[PDB]
Amino acid sequence: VETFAFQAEIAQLMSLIINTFYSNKEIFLRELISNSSDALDKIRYESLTDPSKLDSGKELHINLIPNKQDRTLTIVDTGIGMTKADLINNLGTIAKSGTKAFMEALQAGADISMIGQFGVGFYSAYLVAEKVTVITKHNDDEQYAWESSAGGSFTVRTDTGEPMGRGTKVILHLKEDQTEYLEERRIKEIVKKHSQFIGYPITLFVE
Ligand SMILES: COc1ccc(-c2c(-c3cc(Cl)c(O)cc3O)noc2NC(=O)C2CC2)cc1
């Protein structure tokens, strides 16, 4: 297991998300579904010139899986997946500029719900989760597990859990007071409100 420090700017963003009073927490789900849709768009596009990129799975979809026993909400997609370089360095480099812009917008009067317009919507996960685990598999790279409970660091390891084929699984370990996001009615409501027109099937599993 390798442990890394977040860039200072991203640590600051996570602290702001964790510490700011903001009731409209449900937007985290829209942001994660958006990221899934983006990843699905990318593998679909690449498959047009290299059909073999779908050898790891032709179905392009999103599953939402609540588990009350484990207090987790899991979002699974069969998108392009992230590489080790994506997880450790490259997405963070991109996130730095987006974070700076988002921070400045907030001081200017924007609200946390606009986070996705700056490309850093993933971090809204910390509105509802005490720990986030991201399991991901890109073609021709290994399956990795990224994890962070904030506090300025994250870890990356090669995942020896069940093989995914291709795509990303975001496991939200929910805060004790955020279990409403395990309820079927609540998840359905949020998907209908914010993710109505996503161009891939979204299947809400039931417990
Ligand atoms: C908004 O920024 C990004 C959005 C998605 C990704 C991504 C993902 C991905 C990332 C997150 Cl956090 C997620 O909840 C779901 C995802 O499927 N898997 O491959 C990617 N690789 C990509 O290149 C995606 C096309 C952009 C990476 C960055």
Side-chain angles (χ1 to χ4, degrees), residues 31-42 75 77 79-82 86 91 119-122 134 136 138 167-170:
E31 299 306 328
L32 298 175
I33 290 173
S34 180
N35 283 6
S36 291
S37 181
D38 290 349
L40 289 160
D41 284 349
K42 194 168 185 169
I75 301 89
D77 67 67
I80 190 83
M82 292 173 283
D86 280 337
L91 298 174
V120 294
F122 165 78
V134 176
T136 195
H138 189 282
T168 298
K169 169 157 57 176
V170 178

Side-chain angles (χ1 to χ4, degrees), residues 10-128:
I10 290 70
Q12 186 177 22
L13 172 66
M14 297 172 70
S15 290
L16 183 158
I17 288 162
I18 290 163
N19 293 329
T20 299
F21 182 78
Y22 182 74
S23 300
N24 181 217
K25 290 174 182 283
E26 68 188 43
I27 64 100
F28 79 92
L29 188 57
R30 171 188 71 198
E31 299 306 328
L32 298 175
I33 290 173
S34 180
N35 283 6
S36 291
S37 181
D38 290 349
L40 289 160
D41 284 349
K42 194 168 185 169
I43 186 67
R44 184 180 58 188
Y45 171 79
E46 298 203 350
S47 78
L48 299 180
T49 53
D50 188 351
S52 80
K53 290 180 173 178
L54 295 180
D55 289 350
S56 44
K58 295 171 187 174
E59 191 181 355
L60 302 187
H61 69 243
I62 301 171
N63 294 153
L64 308 176
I65 308 174
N67 189 306
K68 280 182 176 181
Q69 292 61 45
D70 302 330
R71 203 207 286 166
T72 55
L73 175 61
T74 300
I75 301 89
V76 184
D77 67 67
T78 48
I80 190 83
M82 292 173 283
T83 63
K84 194 178 183 187
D86 280 337
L87 294 174
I88 296 168
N89 191 31
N90 293 337
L91 298 174
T93 292
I94 300 293
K96 185 171 156 55
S97 58
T99 296
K100 178 174 185 293
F102 179 48
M103 293 299 207
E104 294 169 351
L106 289 170
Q107 306 298 160
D111 77 287
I112 287 167
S113 78
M114 309 172 61
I115 189 171
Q117 314 187 36
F118 306 89
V120 294
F122 165 78
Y123 298 99
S124 70
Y126 291 88
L127 291 168
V128 301

